[PDB]
Amino acid sequence: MHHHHHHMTRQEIFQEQLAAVPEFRGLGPLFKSSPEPVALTESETEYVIRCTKHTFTNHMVFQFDCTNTLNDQTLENVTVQMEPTEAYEVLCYVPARSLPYNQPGTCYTLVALPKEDPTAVACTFSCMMKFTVKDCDPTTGETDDEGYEDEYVLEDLEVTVADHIQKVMKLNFEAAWDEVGDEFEKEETFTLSTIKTLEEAVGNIVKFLGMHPCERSDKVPDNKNTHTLLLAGVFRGGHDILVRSRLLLLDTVTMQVTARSLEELPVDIILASV
Ligand SMILES: [Mg+2]
């Protein structure tokens, strides 16, 4: 046999970084990280704040990679305070100790996932940078050690169902469907009373759920007013979540959505979210 060398993935690298923060020691394995960050300030403003969402089994860590672009200040003890609309609970802030001009640094916010009503995955967080400002001379580097506390309002951060699911390919959706079986199979019919094409309905569902459309089911053929969308993912904690939507277009769209998993909670989440 030929022996390959292991190359670390993006997820393995984040896992290593996060396992090195003492506050995150008991979170269990990293489940997923958002494939691209979100900017929480407008372009060409004082700060660049790039947020990556890291999902664990029962928690989420929000990583903020932060740049102070102003040459007449250094920021210290920087966090991004987060206030949720729903029952996510902030547990810990890990600050960036120092943000000198044009030297990026990372802070984190740790939150628990909703316990009492675990289907409540949608949440909006009001975000505010909190920090100490120390004036410094742009040319001399000289810093005034008498700092003061300040804050800076950021854009809201949205968390959705797509943050709790990792997309996964299934080449044979029906085999996967059968393998999971029907112990927690649930179906709900939804009326999409504003939507007048199958293409819009399918595109919207695929984007919202953040699951993988199997067997080219994200492509609607011409001459058809019926269609079946087949979606696959893995829910946090490692169990597959599979969704079938049977859509019918008559003036507008109606659909029968069925979900299967070995775990009841993701099925409930899909149906509540859609
Ligand atoms: Mg200034």
- Report CA torsion sign: 253, 263, 119, 37: negative
Query: By CB neighbour count within 10 A (0-12 exposed, 13-18 middle, 19+ buried), where does 71 fall?
Result: middle
Cα of 57 vs centre of ligand 1, distance in Å, is 43
Ligand 1 centre from 76 Cα, in Å?
A: 16
Tell how far the Cα of 71 is from the centroid of ligand 1, in angstroms.
8
Instruction: Give dist(CA 7, CA 59) in Å, integer.
Output: 27
Residue 146 C-alpha to ligand 1 middle, in angstroms? 16
Q: Tell me the residues surrounding ligand 1 (ion) with CB < 5 Å.
A: 72
For 237-242, the CB contacts below 8 A with 24+ separation are 237/31, 237/57, 237/263, 238/31, 239/263, 239/266, 240/168, 240/176, 240/180, 241/165, 241/211, 241/266, 241/267, 241/270, 242/170, 242/173, 242/176, 242/177, 242/180
CA of 259 to the centre of ligand 1 (A): 55
3-class SS string, 143-202: ECCCCEEEEEECCCEEECHHHHEEECCCCCHHHHHHHHCCCCCEEEEEEECCCCCHHHHH
Q: How far apart are the CA of 108 and the centre of ligand 1, in A?
A: 26
In angstroms, what is the span from residue 151 Cα to ligand 1's centroid? 14
CA of 77 to the centre of ligand 1 (A): 19
- Helix (H) or strand (E) run with residue 258 in it: strand 252-261
Domains, the chain: 1-160 (2.60.40.1480), 161-274 (3.30.310.10)
Q: How many angstroms does the Cα of residue 198 sit away from the middle of ligand 1?
A: 53
3-state secondary structure of 32: strand
3-state secondary structure 115-152: CCCCCCCCEEEEEEEEEEEEEECCCCCCECCCCEEEEE
Method: X-ray
229 neighbors 245 (Cβ within 8 angstroms): yes
Documented resolution in Å: 1.9
- Token pair of 239 as six digits: 């169990």
Q: What distance in angstroms lies between residue 267's CA and the mean position of ligand 1's atoms?
A: 52
User: How many angstroms is it from 102 CA to the middle of ligand 1?
Assistant: 14
How many Å apart are CA 236 and CA 233, to the nearest integer?
Answer: 10
Q: What is the DSSP string of 233-246?
A: EEETTTEEEEEEEE
Distance, in Å, from the CA atom of 215 to the CA atom of 15, rounded to the nearest integer, reads 32
Task: Please tell me the distance between residue 69's alpha carbon and the centre of ligand 1 in angstroms.
Answer: 11
